[PDB]
Here is the input.
Amino acid sequence: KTIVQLPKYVDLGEWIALNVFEFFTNLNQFYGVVAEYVHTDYLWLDANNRQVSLPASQYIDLALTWINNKVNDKNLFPTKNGLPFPQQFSRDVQRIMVQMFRIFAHIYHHHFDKIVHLSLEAHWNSFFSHFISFAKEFKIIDRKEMAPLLPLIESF
Amino acid sequence: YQSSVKYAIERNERRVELETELTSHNWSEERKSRQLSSLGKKESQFLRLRRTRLSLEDFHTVKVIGKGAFGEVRLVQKKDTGKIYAMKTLLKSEMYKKSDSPWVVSLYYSFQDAQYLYLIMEFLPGGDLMTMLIRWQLFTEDVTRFYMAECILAIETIHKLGFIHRAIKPDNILIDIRGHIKLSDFGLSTGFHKTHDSNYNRQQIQTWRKSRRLMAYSTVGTPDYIAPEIFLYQGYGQECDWWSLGAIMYECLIGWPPFCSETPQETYRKIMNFEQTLQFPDDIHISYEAEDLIRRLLTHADQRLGRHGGADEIKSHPFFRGVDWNTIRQVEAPYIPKLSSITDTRFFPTDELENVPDSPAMIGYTYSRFDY
Ligand SMILES: Nc1ncnc2c1ncn2[C@@H]1O[C@H](COP(=O)(O)OP(=O)(O)NP(=O)(O)O)[C@@H](O)[C@H]1O
Here is the structure.
């Protein structure tokens, strides 16, 4: 609710770049729980000859690591000084938000099975409820790629 | 995947942190209406800050300064901006034990590698009181009164923060650009002398005690205080550090510490004795009040009938004629370090040693408020 809303008199870019940085790190400790051990879909990375098929989950390793590469970059993410950001990140952050949505979703469809035996469910519930609320608030993700989440979302 | 409910127990304090930080944002609405003032666009811009990310190698190293068992200290310029910093290297396993005051070195923030912790400090250009005593054995009297005092006030502050140093030494005391004195802190660096040791051509006592200064150190830590309540048992309190003063005081004036033993275990020994084993030399110069102090510093830390009960009353000694105790921090210093630059290591024994029986061999800001 109040949390993800841009605070009074903060540049959104910081407010965004911090918030996206928080989120990556949380999903990964969550998949850190699910580490190893492993309708339809949509697959990507084209053209390049890429974007084909058959991830059958357990891909996720080279998927997250591009955010790892994209969000650790000096020029894309200006930690340094007061040097500003290209703001074209608004496009890029949408990717890193949506590319993040994949593992969110994949963790929901197939692997949500193991989570509940640990009684840690509410954590991922909230954290997932956390992710959408933010990016939906800022419209960081379109309503058409939320289709798998659409039956789960509206429960309110 | 056994302990992965750790991502539960953490991520609460992740949500916990996330909440107060934001109720903190509401430190705004500070709202001075005591201004009938502007209007006039806006006086509020909030950057805001960041927890960013960080690393080593964001610091160029200039020269090495000193060394310790846990690790070396260092003079580093931040690659990023350029600046000069006192850099401390420490160690994670293996090593055990699993602000605001003019007197003590400034630890700003910290960061860490795989095996080493890193501390970043204001850099003190003037060496320490170790390398001074060496430079010219302080011809003192009045020199000493200054560098005490300034030591007392240092110490008396620390105690008043509810702290006992239990490390007070020539090398553990540092000289600033005005040649004044700040002590830093134990870091916290540790280890202990216990329990007890068992084995069972000179021509000057001065020259004989000059068999001191042995293999740099890089092993240490010797009894340049060690009041004798530490060995033995659980004990001390504020009076710990006053013994270290008399220990220290005695040395700049005499030419070695009281118990200087020629083996690290003949202290305890002598020190565990004093009484018998305290002796001022035959090289004459000491005041009647200057000696009187040491002996009352160097006595038993004894409470019961007495007090000490101290930390002032030391100021009540005749050894200190004046000064105000006020004007002290602005006063011409006995030695004002003369430097070639902001990088002058001139005052440190740059040396060479390089031994660390450690390596195999081969970041965060989650803080709260903002400086400066
Ligand atoms: N903040 C500082 N600025 C400049 N020099 C420093 C600073 N801190 C430490 N040094 C130097 O490094 C030496 C010792 O470092 P230190 O942190 O005291 O090592 P240690 O093993 O932790 N404690 P010690 O037993 O005194 O060596 C000092 O005597 C100084 O010469």
Q: What stands out?
A: Chain B touches chain A through 25 residues (CB under 8 Å). The helical segments of chain B are 6-25, 129-135, 142-147, 150-160, 205-208, 239-254, 269-273, 288-297. Residues B 65-66, 68-70, 73, 86, 88, 105, 121, 123-124, 128, 130, 171-172, 174, 184, 187, 189, 220-221, 348 surround ANP (CB under 6 Å). Residues 6-25 of chain B form the longest helix (20 residues).
